Design an enzyme around this catalytic site. Sequence first.
Site, short mmCIF file in Angstrom:
data_model
loop_
_atom_site.label_atom_id
_atom_site.label_comp_id
_atom_site.label_asym_id
_atom_site.label_seq_id
_atom_site.Cartn_x
_atom_site.Cartn_y
_atom_site.Cartn_z
N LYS C 148 44.18 44.45 50.43
CA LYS C 148 43.17 44.08 51.41
C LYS C 148 42.56 45.31 52.12
O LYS C 148 43.27 46.27 52.37
CB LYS C 148 43.73 43.05 52.40
CG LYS C 148 43.62 41.61 51.85
CD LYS C 148 43.41 40.58 52.97
CE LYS C 148 42.33 39.52 52.60
NZ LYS C 148 42.61 38.72 51.36
N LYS C 174 47.59 43.77 42.73
CA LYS C 174 46.64 42.91 42.01
C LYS C 174 45.19 43.23 42.41
O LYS C 174 44.90 43.33 43.60
CB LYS C 174 46.96 41.43 42.34
CG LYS C 174 45.74 40.50 42.41
CD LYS C 174 46.07 39.00 42.23
CE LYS C 174 44.79 38.19 42.02
NZ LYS C 174 43.93 38.01 43.30
N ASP C 176 41.53 41.98 43.18
CA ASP C 176 40.85 40.76 43.50
C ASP C 176 39.99 40.26 42.31
O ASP C 176 39.45 41.04 41.50
CB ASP C 176 39.96 40.90 44.75
CG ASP C 176 39.36 39.56 45.16
OD1 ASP C 176 40.15 38.69 45.67
OD2 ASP C 176 38.16 39.29 44.82
N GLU C 177 39.87 38.95 42.19
CA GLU C 177 39.10 38.40 41.13
C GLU C 177 37.62 38.79 41.22
O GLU C 177 36.96 38.81 40.24
CB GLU C 177 39.27 36.89 41.08
CG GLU C 177 38.46 36.17 42.19
CD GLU C 177 39.28 35.72 43.41
OE1 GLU C 177 40.40 36.27 43.76
OE2 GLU C 177 38.76 34.77 44.06
N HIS C 267 43.87 34.74 36.12
CA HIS C 267 43.49 34.25 37.44
C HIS C 267 42.64 33.02 37.19
O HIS C 267 41.93 32.98 36.19
CB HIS C 267 42.67 35.32 38.17
CG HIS C 267 42.44 35.02 39.62
ND1 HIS C 267 41.41 34.23 40.05
CD2 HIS C 267 43.13 35.40 40.72
CE1 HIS C 267 41.46 34.12 41.37
NE2 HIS C 267 42.49 34.82 41.81
N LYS C 307 52.50 21.47 51.90
CA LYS C 307 51.99 20.37 51.05
C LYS C 307 52.96 19.19 51.06
O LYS C 307 54.17 19.41 51.09
CB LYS C 307 51.65 20.84 49.62
CG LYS C 307 50.16 21.31 49.49
CD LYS C 307 49.85 22.24 48.30
CE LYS C 307 49.80 21.53 46.92
NZ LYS C 307 51.11 21.55 46.13
#
Lengths: 428, 428, 428, 428, 104, 104, 104
Positions: C148, C174, C176-177, C267, C307
Amino acid sequence: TYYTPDYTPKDTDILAAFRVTPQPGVPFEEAAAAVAAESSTGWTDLLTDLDRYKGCCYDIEPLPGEDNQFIAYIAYPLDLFEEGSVTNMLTSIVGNVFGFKALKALRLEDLRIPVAYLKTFQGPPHGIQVERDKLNKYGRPLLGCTIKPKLGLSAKNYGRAVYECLRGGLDFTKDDENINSQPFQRWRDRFLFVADAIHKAQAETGEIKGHYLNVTAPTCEEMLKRAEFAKELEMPIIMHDFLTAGFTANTTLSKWCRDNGMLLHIHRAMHAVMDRQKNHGIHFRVLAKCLRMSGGDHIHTGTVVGKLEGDKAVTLGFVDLLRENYIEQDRSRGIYFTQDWASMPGVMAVASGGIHVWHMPALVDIFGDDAVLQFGGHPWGNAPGATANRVALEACIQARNEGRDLMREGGDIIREAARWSPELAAAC
Amino acid sequence: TYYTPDYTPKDTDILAAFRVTPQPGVPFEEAAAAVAAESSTGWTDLLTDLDRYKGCCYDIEPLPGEDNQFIAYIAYPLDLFEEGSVTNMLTSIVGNVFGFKALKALRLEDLRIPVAYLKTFQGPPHGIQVERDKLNKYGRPLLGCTIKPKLGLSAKNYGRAVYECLRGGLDFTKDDENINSQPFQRWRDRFLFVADAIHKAQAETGEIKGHYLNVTAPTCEEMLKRAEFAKELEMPIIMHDFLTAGFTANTTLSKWCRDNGMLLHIHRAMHAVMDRQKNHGIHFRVLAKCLRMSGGDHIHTGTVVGKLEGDKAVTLGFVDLLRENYIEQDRSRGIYFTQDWASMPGVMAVASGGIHVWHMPALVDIFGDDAVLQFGGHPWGNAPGATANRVALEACIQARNEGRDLMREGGDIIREAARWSPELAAAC
Amino acid sequence: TYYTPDYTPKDTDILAAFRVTPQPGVPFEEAAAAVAAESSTGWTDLLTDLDRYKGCCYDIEPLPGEDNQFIAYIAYPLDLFEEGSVTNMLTSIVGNVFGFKALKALRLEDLRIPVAYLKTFQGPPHGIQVERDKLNKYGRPLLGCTIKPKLGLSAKNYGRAVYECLRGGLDFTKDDENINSQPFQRWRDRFLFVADAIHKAQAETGEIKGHYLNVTAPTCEEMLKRAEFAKELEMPIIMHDFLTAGFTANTTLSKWCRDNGMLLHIHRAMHAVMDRQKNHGIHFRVLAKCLRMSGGDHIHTGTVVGKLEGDKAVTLGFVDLLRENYIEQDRSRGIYFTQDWASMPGVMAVASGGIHVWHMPALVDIFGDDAVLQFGGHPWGNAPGATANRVALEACIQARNEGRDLMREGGDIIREAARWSPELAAAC
Amino acid sequence: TYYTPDYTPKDTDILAAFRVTPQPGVPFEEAAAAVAAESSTGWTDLLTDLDRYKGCCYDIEPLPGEDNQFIAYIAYPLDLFEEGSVTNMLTSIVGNVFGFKALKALRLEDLRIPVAYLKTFQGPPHGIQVERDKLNKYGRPLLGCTIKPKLGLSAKNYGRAVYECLRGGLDFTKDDENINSQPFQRWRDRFLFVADAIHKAQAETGEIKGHYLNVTAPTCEEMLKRAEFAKELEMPIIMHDFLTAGFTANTTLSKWCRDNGMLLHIHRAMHAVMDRQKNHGIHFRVLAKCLRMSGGDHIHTGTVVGKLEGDKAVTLGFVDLLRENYIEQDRSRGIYFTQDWASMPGVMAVASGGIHVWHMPALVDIFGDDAVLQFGGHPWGNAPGATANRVALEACIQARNEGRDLMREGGDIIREAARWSPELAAAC
Amino acid sequence: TLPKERRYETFSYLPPLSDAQIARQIQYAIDQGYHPCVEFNETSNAEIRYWTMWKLPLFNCTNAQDVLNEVQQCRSEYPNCFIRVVAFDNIKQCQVMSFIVYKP
Amino acid sequence: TLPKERRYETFSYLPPLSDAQIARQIQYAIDQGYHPCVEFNETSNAEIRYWTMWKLPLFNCTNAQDVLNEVQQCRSEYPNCFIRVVAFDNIKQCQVMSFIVYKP
Amino acid sequence: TLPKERRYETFSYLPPLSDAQIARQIQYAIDQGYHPCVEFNETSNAEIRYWTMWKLPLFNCTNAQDVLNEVQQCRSEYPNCFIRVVAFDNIKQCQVMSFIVYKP
Ligand SMILES: [Cl-]
Ligand SMILES: [Cl-]
Ligand SMILES: [Cl-]
Ligand SMILES: [Cl-]
Ligand SMILES: [Cl-]
Ligand SMILES: [Cl-]
Ligand SMILES: [Cl-]
């Protein structure tokens, strides 16, 4: 016409010795002509000189004892055969004749490959002498273990077994002939973890290590891609199933091995389908001469343990055909013709199947230095079992060199070594 | 452990049916287990689940009459085999087991290839239906002549023979399996004069002509080069010796043929080395299944002329296995398992060896439309001999289609046609 | 015709389970027939056997509670589908039917891929077991951090963040997409500085580190060129956005990853466009099965935090579909069909989105070992926040192995570890 | 921060218009901000200037009537997006935001692509104008038939149907979107027989003919190989499923089509999975703009027959967005933004689904010249049914050009022509 | 059974046009602001890309007749040649009409 | 010495078949469950792939005469054209017959 | 500020285990039906694929003590080698544990 007992073969002819069983009521002379005709020529007829393309039987040799069998010697002119092509030589000689109806059975026992035809082939990509020079291993047989179980280990677990075997003092480990690429173990993972195993064993021992990575594959492209990856990993040796893959693929691989400096171990999977029955098929020594021509640096030659002295002599016969430059005709060892190899390199004999340390003295005595002794469980595991075999081997070689008789003193030599080697002792 | 008569095979299992001849004193149940073990699994052992990698004998069927023989049915799990690899399938099943010492003899009779394994193979590059569409030939067998002499014609003389045959009304002429490239006739010259012959015959007759140009070669590179040159000349069909070249080479060529629109005729040189003796070897029907999977558009299936009704039934059995989508188990014809081909295309049956015009009615009746009838002298030469066989064929097909009984009225049908065809008459 | 409630599906059929909402006044049986017709066959008609190409609805299952909704089970024959093509399977099944006017809404809930179809696909380039062996990481979930801000860091500042994360004890970082190649940060520069970061972190920690370098690209040539550069840099893992790029590109990349030993992180950008509404679209489990077939080694599976227990069971359902060999039909978890993967390797589940250290015990308990836990700020920065997550995970794993109950003892386990880890403490 | 109602968009910004359905109790302003934030930026934070990478909602438009729905307008800076990548533009905008939990539903309605971003794309490989110049077809819509049955014809039978359709007066025939390469019909055989059909029709009629040969494939390599073989056969046009194949593969194909002079017909298989429900997904007009950028010469746009005047206006809106250079904002037709295409070529609209000759006057009036009218049985078969459609079309065009009103005089215009065309009469 | 017969693109599936019919089409082109032109060639097939221009385009006559005259003049000078009328849109730099007006 | 003569695939080596012979061939096809069809073309040579269909295939009239009728109807209208009978198997999706019935 | 310190994979971020912690770890492996094994090596870094096997794997002793005995006997004979406990799942043919138990 096809039976000419006065023909004397030229030095450039290919000669074949067939063991023929005629159908009841077929005389020997007609069966013999049929063998020569059906393996050769069989208005445009008088456009050509058919005389110079026919095979002929130049000799019929009865077989004392045998029932209704004889040896037919056939001569083929040099010009029938494609240069450098074992495929075309086999197609020409054995393509057709084995189904001829006037024969009950037919077995090809031997072929005399003429020097002029041999010079059209590469032969082994390396051969015995160059192979020892690349591996730096002199004055002894080489040692290998096969990994067990045959199938089922993951690539990483497989590599662990290879490391432990190698680091114990074996020169080589071996893929099973069934292991190509499969759901439980894809080839590229295997090649990679095997290379790590070799690197670690080679660094710990200070001795060159190898593993016959199997590149047998569905297509030539895929075979060559596996070979190139072994090359990329700096592997010294790979493996091929020459009969189930075929001589076209094998000859391709053999040239590639020569071009790239790679040693080629040849496995003979399927040979017993053709080579086992005495009345019909093709004797292994013929498949062996073909393999030398197409090319391999090692070949499996069978074991000599628990075999009659006559089976043993036959094996030694074809072992000389694989390794020597010049082999004199000798029927007591199944050599039908004198074979001159014209400096084509020899292939290492690989002895395997049901061998243990106590066989070591006999193995060294029977094969001498130019062989791979392929074993494949020690009580303490892989690395100790490998040490045990390696100490046993070195003990035998020292003993032989000292003039000791390995057939009589064998157990003694092993017992003496067991005294200062705990691994060897545990193996007794 | 290896003999489990309660196991029921999965639809994904490969099944094998072996004719087994145990050594004197070996009981059937041990030989069966040995057949299963030696063709599969045979401390790291307990790292793997060996259960899921074993073959097992699930049934032993004694053979009434036969001495000391029985049928062992083996099941192998899908996961043992490399996808798309006939080479690996053969290595796995027949690589090892035929040399086992407790067996006196062993013959593989049949194999049940499961749908899930078949889907990993290409199969024939074209197959029966596509091939008729490319050639434009419907409602009859195709016709071929082999050129004679086998060897010795120069390329140009060879092309002259081809042109005369084709212009007479044959669809195809054929290279001998021995002719690859030789001092008397280099392949590039042959390919070029054959293409001239085809072009002239096709323009004279208005029918598509072909010649099975033999690409069998010493290496894969040289095989593909001969293929590409046939493609460059716009030839519709080539030929390969699958057994003497090998399955690795054959699979390569079969994929290249699919990629390039080329028809592939497969010759079975060397098959009797393995497939002829009843006690030992591999039945041709297994070689034929393997060939369908690796790929071919035609394959020689042998003649039916001058053979017993029981040999005929066996041939018809494996002809169905080559051509149909679904073949029901049927021992009276040598089909040991039901075989589902899952829409893999069928291969044209090629009937050849000692056939003449008067065999025509029986050949049409026996093989039906999907066959090539391969002949190979007429009194007036090549073109008249070809017209005779072509009229004879067309007479039999018209007669059949009219409901006439080709087995009883054969001679009549031929005699009627001989009345308005001088070429056919001269052939009687 | 298209509704055949007596048809029993073959093991080779592809089966689909659609949640159908008919338009008011359309009876269930017509809507079901329509579903099967519009997803299949829909004078030349009587040239073909249309029976063997149709889909059919073999079962209509009403839905208690739901208004005007039901489950239609469709079966499609094997032969409709191109081998190896997820693109063709999707086009054939969902290409057309979702626009049919007699349906108010349609959602594809599940598909049963038959073994015979699966064997035509490569599947994951590596899969869980191989991946752990390449990375040398056993007995625990793996750990990742996203970087980030998403966009805006220069390549070099980006690599600094990656280095600090990895050296703290995470296994992976990772891309970002959204980061492919952009004016503020060109891909080649990112690949280069990321490789430096991995090399430094790997050397400092003595653990294998990786970064999912995004190769998602405008064209396949450009995607493969980014992949080749990662391979040049000896990166162990790359990333691809399979839905926005497409299954054609993805299948290309998956094969390249197999060929080159590269791990592939998938992803699922854009999935909620299709997979979110209960009445219409395609369930994520279908897209997940397609991904496993096309190929990936990891795939995002959503988080389980905050959830309901029923959403959680559905997630666990598809996680089993991604990781296991055999999954039994189980509607309480949204498995409509029994799914046999025939040894196709499993894919690692990646859990991400709003996770923190206090979730750790629950995550380990829910997913077990075969998962990546992807986090993404600690008060002391990147390396301490990574240590915190790494000590937390190791504490949970120790506890679990000790027989402690992670759902009840969780906070205790974390609190005990926080006592000897300042980083973990600071994170509470 | 993310909601800035005073921001005015730059001409280089990408703009998105989302129809947003917030969860009960989420106020519009927070849902708007969330849409902007979750589709963009969402210690290193203060290394970058996050302001210039955020999207922002610059306008919230309540929807009179609609329950809890509004239009959120988002602006994104030009620098967020990879040049020439539709893939990256999708991933950026719709990658993430549709799963945000504070939204009950989300639909992307329109995008304003700025001139400066458009210039980084190739667009259609040819476009309306060049396509008519290549085909030599002016002053009328083009005409296509789909071949029936969809699946199951052999390649050769398939080619027969194509020939009969084309020789009757259609410009094009079309592969079904499910036909790629299958057991019943391999792609190479299809491409070959279809080229024969085109050559025969084109020579009989003296008009250029084509067939959209479907190159949709498992991988990019196999897609480009199918494209290359169409090129080798000199086919003028091919087809691609852009959504099931993906924008990475489609962009690759579109460049290849420009490089090679090939026309590219785009089929929209799967569009209704995403574009059908009013509350959630992506409107087809967005997918159409993306396709125009990635590239296509034709695209299916749906039929206008049997649809309300408000659906019709929406179709016409997106037809203009596909064909024109400049489209003014116009909400009554679903155009949310003025779209300037900066000379990127337009794409032909393809009208298909349930059309017959009596629809002809309406179709010509609705679409004008720049359309393909795709039909797909006449009583007398393919060639007569083709002539019927071709005369009907030419009749309507003559009538239009004459000043007649095609909506009032349609039936008359058709009846007049039916008087001198028996094929057209038979179709009434 | 449909007969096999050479066609000629737009309007070749209708009865050959009367002179009054040719005029009405030409008037449509004039009313749209297109620029009509006449061309001919000795043959017509799929493979032929360009025909030969008759004189010049007519660059804003208000009346179909002067074009029709040109068609009549061409038809009488070259009765063994195909003829068609074409119309250009200069705005979009595209051809928007090309119909067969005379065959041998 | 063989003469050079263009031929026409199946049955083109036989003397031309009688209408009764054609009807027997057709009858065989009907009794096998095949679907007969008629087609014709202006020439025949090796490079031609497709002929033109005469009307449509008749899908299962039980009598060979209606099919013969078509042959002769084609023969009288198109007497400069080659004509042949084709038969399709719809199961195996393959053509199983293709014979020359009339040559110009 | 996080120190720079070499790690050794699973459990290397915890306090080194006690012999009692080592025993419970082992017991879990036994209770799951896994096969424990001991292995040692002179160094640890990321490039090292294979450690060396200590004797053999223990092939279904339900007591963790003799496994622990092997570690202790390894530790005392080889006081300069890193040592670890692994465990295998023979069904799945994969390793399910690998934890560091001793550092020099
Ligand atoms: Cl052996
Ligand atoms: Cl037999
Ligand atoms: Cl034969
Ligand atoms: Cl759900
Ligand atoms: Cl996610
Ligand atoms: Cl709408
Ligand atoms: Cl559509």
